Each structure stands twice: as structure tokens, then as C-alpha cells.
Amino acid sequence: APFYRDTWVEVDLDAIYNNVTHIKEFIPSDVEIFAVVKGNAYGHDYVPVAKIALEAGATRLAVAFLDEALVLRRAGITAPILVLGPSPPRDINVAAENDVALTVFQKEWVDEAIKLWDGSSTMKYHINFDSGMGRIGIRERKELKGFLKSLEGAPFLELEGVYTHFATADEVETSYFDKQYNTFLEQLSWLKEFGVDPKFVHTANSAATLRFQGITFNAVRIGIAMYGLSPSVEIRPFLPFKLEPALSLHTKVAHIKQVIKGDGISYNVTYRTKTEEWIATVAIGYADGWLRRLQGFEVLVNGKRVPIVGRVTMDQFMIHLPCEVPLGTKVTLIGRQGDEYISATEVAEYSGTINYEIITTISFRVPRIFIRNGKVVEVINYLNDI
Template identity: 55%
Template sequence: MAPFYRDTWVEVQLDHIYENVKSMREYLPVETHIMAVVKANAYGHGAFQVAKTALQAGASFLAVAFLDEALSLRKKGINVRILVLGAIRHEDAILAAEHDITVTVYQKEWLLRALKNHSFRKKLRIHLKVDTGMGRLGIKEFTELNEIIELIQHEENIDIDGVYTHFATADEVNTDYFDRQYGTFLEALAILNAHQVDIPHIHCGNSAAGLRFPTKVFNVVRMGIAMYGLSPSEEINGLLPFTLKEAFSLHSRLIHVKKLQPGDKVSYGATYTAEEEEWIGTIPVGYADGWIRRLKNREVIVEGQRVPIIGRICMDQFMVKLPGPMELGSKVTLIGSQGNEVIPIDEIARELETINYEIPCMISFRVPRIYIQSDQIVEVENHLN
């Protein structure tokens, strides 16, 4: 296990990831596969450990955003099918084929360039991406979809393994736009059927769609945010079919405790002034770790008690007001539970006026990840060592 030499760390409860995937597996129709989305270093949790756990829990495939992420998993011994959801350079298609990495075809021009410039020794496995209203990546015009299919049907080195789309509003209670996108996707599938193209994997469901519409997502669900124990949105919390178990927590320790006198100042800009004798503690986490300055009004948990952050958050440290003198080394929880207190990721997201997806992603690589399974540390990941 990689050692680390700072008093700040993330804990990832692999059992929670396992249970979230297992719950989804039991909830979906038996013929529906789970594609575990481990892009962005598994939303900040750690791609390799999450991938292994998700596959053990019943996931069939993996998905990432970029070719680099897929290659990293291959180098670590992950051999299942991996779909790159984002665009890759056409000149890298041959590399994807060599490593049996499935790529997204979203444009005729991209495909023409990939085929023109390379001689594939292995088949290139692809999923067609249809833009039904997300407006991000995908084939929007059905004429272009027809042309792509006709082009592929004459290419021996291309294997159409799947077709998919992505919903913009599956995490909203109102389904009007969802229904509109779904109808457009059905039209695209009708075109494929007219060409008599046999496509093994059809998917339109992210976590939200999979949780809400299990019989409408065809035979693959891309499980992302729910795998990590987070709801796709607070709006649909009441619609979730099973309890999600949050896997990510962030901890540190008190490294310095001192008493202030009335009038003493704290941190950059001297924005905080002690009004009486106060005890403050210093915690070795800062905005370089992803605990950004806008979190200056937050609370953290020290020895089971919520305490307020005071003054401005620095690059590597911040200060809190303590109820009294506390022991050096006392555990501090920024995200997660300690004693009877809990700070969920959604609470941090509300403070920052953002979504829960962003919070674990923004905790930087320099914070070690400790992986826990059956109450035992199974691995420590430290990118600085």
C-alpha cells in the first residue's frame, strides 16, 4: 500500500459501491446489463478500485470519458469491454482497436477520416451516439445516420456493438422533454431496423432513467452517480426505488490548537476578529485540495461536534472555532459521518449552489484515497508517492 505523510485523506467505502450496484442489478430486468461509469477517476473515488468492485457486484461493462482513461484501466488488468463516451481523435482509432476499447461514433466525417488514414489489424468496436436533444455529442440528422450505416455496412473492420443516446432531463420530475427525446431515439432505432442492422447493445438510461424507467431503457443502463450512493437530483429523491449508500468521505486532523484574545484576527485579509477568548484549530486542508474558498461559511465535525470555519480558507489550511481546547490529532470530518453528526455531499453541494456530482470530483489528486472493504483497509492510493 502506498504510504502518505499528511493528516488528510478520503475514505471510499467499497461495500457501499458494491451494494448500490447490487441493488440496481436486482431492480432492473434480468436481461438488462449495467455499464459502470468510472470516468473522471470514478467521480473522484478511484477508477480501478471502483471498476473492480462494480464488476464483482454485477456490472457487465465499463464506461469512461476519454481514451486515456480506458488505456489506464487496461494497463491495470481490467479486461472487460470499456466504452469511451467522449470523442477520440480519429488517428487514435487504431490504438483503441488494438486494445479492444469501444469508441463512440458521433459524426460521419470522423468515421471517414478514421477509415481513410488507418489499416486496422483488429476490428474497431463502436457504439453509435444519437443526439436526441442533449445538443452535446451525437448524430443529429437522420440523413447522416443513414449514411453512416451504409458506410459501415461496407467495412469489414468495423463492428457496431451498440447505439445510444443521453437524456438531458431524466433527473427532473416533469417528463415532457424526456418523452420527446425518447420518441426521437425510437425513430433512430427504426432506421437501424430498416437497414437490418443487428445491434447487441441499446442504451439510453443514465442513473436517473434507470432508476425511474427500468423497462424503457432497453438492455443496458449506464450507472454513474447512483453507483456512488448519490441521487441524480434532490428533485427525485422521493422517487428512488431503493436506498443509496454514500461511499465518499473526507477527513483530516487538528494539527494546531491555540487560544485567541479579544481583537485577534484570523487568516488572509484579517476578516475574522475574535470577540472574546476563543480556541481555534488549524486543519491541513485548503483550496489546492478542492476545499475551495467559497466554503468559508461551512461547518466541519471535530470529535463528534459541528464547529464553524472562521476566516478565509488558505491554499493548504483553514481554521475553525472550537468549543474549547482539544487534543492535537483530533479527527476532523469535512464530508461524512462522525459520532451522531453527518455532513452529506448534498449539503456541500447546496452551499456551493451546484450538484453533488461536482463535490467528489473537485477533491484533488493530492488527497490520498483509502479504500475500505468489510471494515478493513484494502488499498491506499497516493498519487504523490
């Protein structure tokens, strides 16, 4: 509901809905979609994205750690939820009680879960196979055999699926991806050899699902493309269909003044005016995730690109405008004004980072406004809840 600063994220639920629909019609009819909503749904908000993705045809959800899955569960979401990151064994009973599946891939985890098990709950798990990402998951045959051996003492753990993750699916040249693919087929053959039906197999992120044959298996795991953004600039030309960006970020001119030639703006007087300059101030800063490294970046005011001048402060930054505009004038940081569009990728490139990081780090103190069919259908202000 209410928010009291004219700084907000806009999430277009139509865009998300369209992206999931187009992916669904692009992949085979017997391949499910996980909506990947970790990191506050990549800054779009856990619950509304999960809900719209499910409506668009996604059947499953994926988060980073257990607390995020519980956000969804408390919202009344009943679709399957998988935790993709590592979890401590102490989560075994709570995950089970909340119908949440964890990725489990260590004998040591199983040993500790046996010790901590409440004696009644049944927890579902997915085996992560590390096929070259080097992050988590089983890498070796002997390692797998020991893992399966420990599971013999843990009848309360039940396999729901098996997966791996690609490290280079967003690079045009495909050697490392091909290597991972071949490594993973071998890992699936180890499981077969040891008498374990994987049941439900998934490998593909946005880049992989949009590019390659033979990797859909039973399900795909879509994050960035559901939000309507390209996994990388280099594969962007080769995407099968147009992605529709869901998130924009806006503020308003909170103050506007003429500052005489030579006067300083912000901390350590890193900017001085060269003439009498129109300087506008907006209520957004690095506490909101709009970082100091974005000094000199251009925002959009009345369809024109105008530079951020002086140090970005915790809650505010300043802009050099060619002319006066009224107080309350919209300033767009990510999104479109007229003929101009600033993508999260453009912000990322100025920042020396990737679009994923730009969108995901928009702070929880910024409200989200949700648009469906051109109309505001929900507003979430997390500050109201804490």
C-alpha cells in the same frame, strides 16, 4: 501505500458493492450494468471501483476519454470499456489495440480514421444518438445516412452498440424525458430502415434506471447511484431503495490555539475573532478541491458542526471551535460523526453546485483508503506514482 499528511478520502467498497447489487436485483435479469468510472470514478478512484462493481455483477465499464480506459487496462481489467465522450480520430488504432470501444457518430471522424488506420486493427464503436441532450451524437436522419455511408469505406470499424442519454431524468415532471424517449425510438427506426441491427441498446443513467419502465433495453449506465448518492434532491423521495454513500473525506487538527479578541485569520483579514477564540487549522485546501467558496461552511469535529473561518488557503483552512480539542482530532468534511452527517449534496448546496462536482474534484494529491468488511484493504496515493 504510504502517505504523509493526515488528510484522506475513505471509500467504502461494501457500499459500492451493495449499491450495484441492489440495482442489479431491481432491473431485469437480462439487463447489463455499465459501471461508469470516468472522472477518477467520480473521485473514488478508477481501478478499485471498477473492480468492486464488476464483482457486484456489473459486466461493463464506461469512461470519458481513452486515457482513462488505459488506466483500467494497465490494472489488468479485461471487461469491456466504452468511451462515452468524443475522441479524436487519431485514437482509432490505440483504442483497437487496447480492446476499448469509442463512441463514433460523425462521417468526418470515419473519413479521418480511414486515413489514419494502421491497416490491421479492428475497433469497436457505439453510435451515440442525441435525442435532446444537445452535447454529442447524431440528431438527424440525413446525418445518420451520411454517417452509415462513410462507414462503407471503413470495414475495420464494427458496431458494438447504440445509445442515447437523458438530460432531465432527475426532474420530477417528465415531459422532456418523454420527448427524448419518443425521439430515440424514431432514431432506432431510422437505423432499422437503413438495415442496421443496433445489436446492443442502452439509454438509462442512474435516475432513469431507478424511476422509469421501458428504458432498460439491453443495459444501463450507472454512475452516481453506484457511489450511493442521489442524482438530485427532488427525486430522492421517489427512489426505490436506500442508496449507501461510499465516499467520506477527513482531516485532522494540525494546530489549535487561542486567538485574542479582534485578531485576524487568513488572507485579507476577512475574519476577526469576537472573543478569545479556539482556532484549529487543518491540512486541506483548494489545491485539494476544497474550494474558497466553502468559507463559512460547517465541518464536523467531535460530532459538532463548526464553521470554517477566514479565507481557505491552497493547502490549509481554519475552524472556530467552542473548546480546545487535542492535536490529531478528526475533522470530517464529508461523512458522519455521531448524530451528524455531511453529504456531498450539502457541501454542493452551500457551494452553489451539485454533488457530482464536489466528489469528482477531490484532487489526485489526496490519498484514498479503501474499506471492505470494516477493514482497510487498499491505500492509493497517486502522488507516489508520478
